[PDB]
Design an enzyme around this catalytic site. Structure first.
Site, PDB file in Angstrom:
ATOM      1  N   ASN A   1       0.810  -1.209   0.000  1.00  0.00           N
ATOM      2  CA  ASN A   1       0.000   0.000   0.000  1.00  0.00           C
ATOM      3  C   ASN A   1       0.848   1.266   0.000  1.00  0.00           C
ATOM      4  OD1 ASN A   1      -2.525  -1.669   0.484  1.00  0.00           O
ATOM      5  ND2 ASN A   1      -1.586  -2.019   2.487  1.00  0.00           N
TER       6      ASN A   1
ATOM      7  N   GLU B   1      -7.128  -4.345  -3.187  1.00  0.00           N
ATOM      8  CA  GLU B   1      -8.128  -5.390  -3.113  1.00  0.00           C
ATOM      9  C   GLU B   1      -9.200  -5.029  -2.080  1.00  0.00           C
ATOM     10  OE1 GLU B   1      -5.085  -8.744  -3.124  1.00  0.00           O
ATOM     11  OE2 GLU B   1      -6.728  -9.609  -4.306  1.00  0.00           O
TER      12      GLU B   1
HETATM   13 MG   LIG Z   1      -2.725  -3.769   2.326  1.00  0.00          MG
END
Ligand SMILES: [Mg+2]
Ligand SMILES: [Cl-]
Ligand code: NA
Length: 214
Positions: A168, A197
């Site tokens: 991320n 996701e």
């Molecule tokens: Mg993540």
């Protein structure tokens, strides 16, 4: 080209000129397909798997656990007697993860610790029989990536060849982390493109109607 150019390039090749609904449909399609290409292509999980099988870590440290997906994913690949140490600050996420890890048949490899990384990390040598870490997975709060990376270093838990794998890093993003490990000659970096996701985030619109100073 940039992703904006590609979207436009797709519309020009495929949408009906002068028809706004056709343009929107075209774009929605372009995105819907890339997202299906990413999910069926299993990009994110294939990447983590690849790193683990490439480096064969025996002591592996995971910062952050949501539903236990990452724990199961990583623990199933370890050799017998390897350890995954998972730190999660949220007791309710910790509980679901343990349940997930028990159900997945990998509890033998996982040591789950509830609390703040900044407090636990300095305890790892003294209290969890860690010498140095072979690998670190960062998937917790983005403001902690750089502080915890520095803290791991200060605490003597990093050795040459220790693999940090940070999720991320674009969205939500960890730019101060990236700036540090990239620019620093103490770290050798590779970037792997992916998309989010469903398990990781959620989004929404706010509608706010002004009512006057009144
Ligand atoms: Mg993540
Ligand atoms: Cl997870
Ligand atoms: Na670097």
């Amino acid at each position: 080209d940039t992703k904006e150019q590609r979207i436009l390039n797709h519309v020009l090749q495929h949408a009906e000129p002068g028809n706004a609904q056709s343009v929107l449909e075209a774009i929605d399609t372009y995105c819907e397909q890339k997202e299906w290409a990413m999910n069926v292509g299993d990009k994110k999980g294939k990447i983590v798997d690849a790193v683990i099988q490439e480096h064969q870590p025996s002591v592996l440290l995971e910062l952050g656990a949501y539903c236990g997906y990452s724990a199961v994913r990583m623990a199933r690949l370890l050799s017998p007697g390897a350890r995954l140490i998972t730190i999660e600050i949220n007791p309710d996420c910790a509980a679901i993860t343990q349940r997930m890890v028990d159900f997945a048949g990998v509890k033998d490899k996982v040591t789950l610790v509830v609390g703040a990384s900044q407090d636990i990390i300095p305890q790892l040598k003294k209290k969890y029989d860690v010498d140095t870490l072979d690998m670190v997975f960062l998937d917790h709060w983005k403001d902690r990536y750089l502080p915890d990376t520095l803290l791991l270093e200060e605490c003597g838990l990093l050795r040459k060849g220790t693999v940090l794998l940070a999720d991320n890093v674009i969205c939500p993003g960890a730019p101060d982390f990236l700036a540090h490990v990239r620019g620093s000659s103490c770290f050798e970096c590779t970037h792997y493109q992916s998309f989010l996701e469903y398990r990781e985030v959620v989004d929404g619109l706010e509608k706010a109607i002004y009512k006057g100073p009144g």
